[PDB]
Design a protein around this ligand. Structure first.
Ligand SMILES: CC(C)C[C@H](NC(=O)[C@H](CC(C)C)OP(=O)(O)CNC(=O)OCc1ccccc1)C(=O)O
Ligand SMILES: [Ca+2]
Ligand SMILES: [Ca+2]
Ligand SMILES: [Ca+2]
Ligand SMILES: [Ca+2]
Ligand SMILES: [Zn+2]
Length: 316
């Protein structure tokens, strides 16, 4: 759309008011011209045909219930863009300011969200297992981060490399949640999962076993479902990343924490310089150690915490 940049206001999934960047040309579109080559939000209208219609509104106010998921997908994709630019110096997912596109209201009662190879897609949930998925900042950033991986290491979505792929998505979604300081935690999806139950989440980084995911390499899933457990074995990496950041004793192995910012810097450098499509857990270990070496010196505390962390979850 070609028009005039403006600012509208709306209410998100959780009922929070926010301002969003729109474009005015007869109608007000969910098109933010302020970030790279733009952030574009589409209405999939309960269908599975993508992307749908660029979101159009007559008055620049987005308070209707149907507007909610579009408001949050558009706003949270701006926050994620900003985290990447400001913290890591990366312009959009490809590093060259590629336009960011998201479609909301995909299908009916759809309990998931995904990156399709070219855009983000968000279901509305069935109302009991999930509310509309874009209402979770860690969900949004998990999604955008799959594009980032796809453009960098290119981790294949199966087995070890696939669980590394999921872990990256969960680690950076959690980092963007602390960046925005939106009630941050080390849990995944808590703001949109099981609206009737408090205190739970989809996955836990601090304690993956809380929901039955492995927290040690010896407990890895070796089967076939879930593309070889990409959403299951990511718990072993998630726990390692939580130990590097926060510290603790796990299975008798003690880790001194080095904090979230260093965790983000070592993981991004491993992702952009050292990992390949077929990297496995032991290679991720070498890549994180090398990153931390590059950045802080071989004899630093940083490098020592990365080794301890991996030794705690049984990786090498
Ligand atoms: C019950 C689900 C939420 C758990 C799970 N999905 C997830 O953990 C998150 C959403 C969470 C963060 C809200 O979704 P993912 O981004 O990992 C689902 N992605 C996914 O399956 O991607 C594969 C793909 C490749 C090309 C084209 C289409 C799709 C799963 O698909 O198993
Ligand atoms: Ca309106
Ligand atoms: Ca939270
Ligand atoms: Ca969270
Ligand atoms: Ca819940
Ligand atoms: Zn994922």
């Amino acid at each position: 759309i070609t028009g005039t940049s403006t600012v509208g206001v709306g209410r998100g999934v959780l009922g929070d008011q926010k301002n969003i960047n729109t474009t005015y040309s007869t109608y007000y579109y969910l098109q933010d011209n302020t970030r790279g080559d733009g952030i574009f939000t589409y209405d999939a209208k309960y269908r599975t045909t993508l992307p749908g219609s660029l979101w159009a509104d007559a008055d620049n106010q987005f308070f209707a219930s149907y507007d909610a998921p579009a408001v949050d997908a558009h706003y949270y994709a701006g926050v994620t863009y900003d985290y990447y630019k400001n913290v890591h110096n990366r312009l959009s997912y490809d590093g060259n300011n590629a336009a960011i596109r998201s479609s909301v209201h995909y299908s009916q009662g759809y309990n998931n969200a995904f990156w399709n190879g070219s855009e983000m897609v968000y279901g509305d949930g069935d109302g009991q297992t999930f509310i509309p998925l874009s209402g979770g900042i860690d969900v949004v950033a998990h999604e955008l981060t799959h594009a980032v991986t796809d453009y960098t290491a290119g981790l294949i979505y199966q087995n070890e490399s696939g669980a590394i792929n999921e872990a990256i998505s969960d680690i950076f979604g959690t980092l963007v949640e602390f960046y925005a300081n939106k009630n941050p935690d080390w849990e995944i999806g808590e703001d949109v999962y099981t609206p009737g139950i408090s205190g739970d989440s989809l996955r836990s980084m601090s304690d993956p076993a809380k929901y039955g995911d492995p927290d040690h390499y010896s407990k890895r899933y070796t089967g076939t479902q879930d593309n070889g457990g990409v959403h299951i074995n990511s718990g072993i990496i998630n726990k390692a990343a939580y130990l590097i950041s926060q510290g603790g004793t796990h299975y008798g192995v003690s880790v001194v924490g080095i904090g979230r910012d260093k965790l983000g810097k070592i993981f991004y450098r491993a992702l952009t310089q050292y990992l390949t499509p077929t990297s496995n857990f032991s290679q991720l270990r070498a890549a994180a150690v090398q990153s931390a070496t590059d950045l802080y010196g071989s004899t630093s505390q940083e490098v020592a915490s990365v080794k301890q962390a991996f030794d705690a979850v049984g990786v090498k």
